[PDB]
Amino acid sequence: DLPQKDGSRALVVAAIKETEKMNFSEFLAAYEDIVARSRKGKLTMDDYQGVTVSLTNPGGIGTRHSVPRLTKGQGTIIGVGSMDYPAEFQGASEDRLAELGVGKLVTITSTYDHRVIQGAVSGEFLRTMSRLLTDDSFWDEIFDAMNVPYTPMRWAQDVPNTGVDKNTRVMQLIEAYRSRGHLIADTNPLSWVQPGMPVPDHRD
Amino acid sequence: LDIETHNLTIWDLDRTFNVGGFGGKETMTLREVLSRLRAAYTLKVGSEYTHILDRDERTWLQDRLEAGMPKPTQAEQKYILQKLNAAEAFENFLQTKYVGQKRFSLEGAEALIPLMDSAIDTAAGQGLDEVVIGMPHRGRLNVLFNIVGKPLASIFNGDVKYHLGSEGQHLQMFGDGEIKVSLTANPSHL
Numbered sequence: 001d002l003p004q005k006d007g008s009r010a011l012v013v014a015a016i017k018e019t020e021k022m023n024f025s026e027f028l029a030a031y032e033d034i035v036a037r038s039r040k041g042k043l044t045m046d047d048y049q050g051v052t053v054s055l056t057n058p059g060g061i062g063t064r065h066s067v068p069r070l071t072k073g074q075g076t077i078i079g080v081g082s083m084d085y086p087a088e089f090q091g092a093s094e095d096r097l098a099e100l101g102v103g104k105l106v107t108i109t110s111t112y113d114h115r116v117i118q119g120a121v122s123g124e125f126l127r128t129m130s131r132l133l134t135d136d137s138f139w140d141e142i143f144d145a146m147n148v149p150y151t152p153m154r155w156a157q158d159v160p161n162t163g164v165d166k167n168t169r170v171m172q173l174i175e176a177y178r179s180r181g182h183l184i185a186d187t188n189p190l191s192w193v194q195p196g197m198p199v200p201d202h203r204d
Numbered sequence: 205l206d207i208e209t210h211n212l213t214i215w216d217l218d219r220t221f222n223v224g225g226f227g228g229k230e231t232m233t234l235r236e237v238l239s240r241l242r243a244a245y246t247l248k249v250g251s252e253y254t255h256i257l258d259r260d261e262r263t264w265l266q267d268r269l270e271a272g273m274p275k276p277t278q279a280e281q282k283y284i285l286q287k288l289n290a291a292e293a294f295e296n297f298l299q300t301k302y303v304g305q306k307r308f309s310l311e312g313a314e315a316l317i318p319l320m321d322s323a324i325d326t327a328a329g330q331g332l333d334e335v336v337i338g339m340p341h342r343g344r345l346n347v348l349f350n351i352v353g354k355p356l357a358s359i360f361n362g363d364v365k366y367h368l369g370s371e372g373q374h375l376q377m378f379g380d381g382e383i384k385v386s387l388t389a390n391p392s393h394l
């Protein structure tokens with residue numbers, strides 16, 4: 001969305017091209033190029049031509065979901081809604097929500113041309129997006145690209161406070177870092193691991 | 205290792221606590237916990253193993269040490285007594301029939317002979333081929349007679365007996381295993 005000389009807002013769609021040949025680092029650079037040039041009025045005619053698929057974000061303002069229109073030339077448009085708690089939880093305590101294990105959600109929509117795309121394909125597409133945003137391999141690939149030294153947080157169900165108390169478990173974590181934490185420390189100025197030597201276990 | 209250092213008193217001895225699979229149990233009393241820890245880590249065998257980094261090899265040692273020494277059979281017990289008898293009999297022969305052998309005496313450390321025998325016998329049951337021994341002066345002629353298996357005639361007849369090498373066979377009393385045993389030559393330089 002770029003404002004005009006008069007003042008009236010007018011949305012136009014610009015394209016990130018050849019996206020099937022990019023890693024996350026390359027993708028992030030390409031994205032921020034389009035946003036940069038738009039803010040200083042340096043987009044050309046070629047930037048607005050050749051779009052295959054589109055993305056919209058009603059969730060910015062706080063809309064829960066939308067049913068948008070599809071422009072001629074394309075097959076699908078994807079929409080991203082709000083990342084808040086549901087309205088039935090918007091007056092509850094942080095303490096009570098933390099006890100139960102209530103998370104935030106995002107709603108995603110797919111609007112498609114029925115002459116060329118069938119409903120089973122559209123459902124399978126949204127199922128793959130759901131799996132990726134909770135998948136170990138997906139978050140490993142992003143961390144690798146951005147040079148984050150730690151292991152990513154993994155997806156799991158909340159466990160009950162039975163057997164060994166959770167306070168005992170937090171004290172055992174403090175001992176582990178004080179004893180074995182040097183095994184994952186940013187000590188090597190090269191990104192080098194000697195292939196001959198054996199790697200110690202650091203699951204602790 | 206004192207219960208005062210961990211803010212626990214005599215008044216906690218008969219109260220029950222969650223122990224997380226210690227002694228293959230979920231719950232236990234402090235009295236029972238102290239008994240087991242003292243039986244495993246404070247009698248005639250002291251162990252250092254918690255510095256090891258691999259979790260699987262730390263757990264293997266932990267399980268064996270906390271299960272304890274198995275109760276040996278009567279036959280096993282009498283075989284340990286026969287090896288100690290032989291060890292002490294040979295020390296007496298050396299001190300009485302020959303002179304200047306006080307330097308080379310094993311008196312005080314006669315349990316070496318049943319320790320070396322235990323290891324060589326365990327290796328024969330695993331199915332291995334040979335055991336090679338290297339050692340200094342102290343107890344050398346005792347090891348030649350009771351572990352390698354040389355005759356007395358061969359021992360007692362250039363350089364001395366205390367530096368030459370030898371070969372022999374070890375059969376297994378309560379099994380079907382055999383194994384070769386070799387002793388290496390060496391100088392006085394430790």
Ligand SMILES: Cc1ncc(C[n+]2csc(CCOP(=O)(O)OP(=O)(O)O)c2C)c(N)n1
Pocket residue numbers: 342392393394
């Ligand atoms: C390289 C070397 N340094 C020093 C000596 C001298 N030396 C002969 S016996 C001896 C004592 C060794 O004592 P220890 O290792 O405790 O065993 P013990 O004889 O009391 O069983 C020393 C220092 C030697 N033989 N070789």
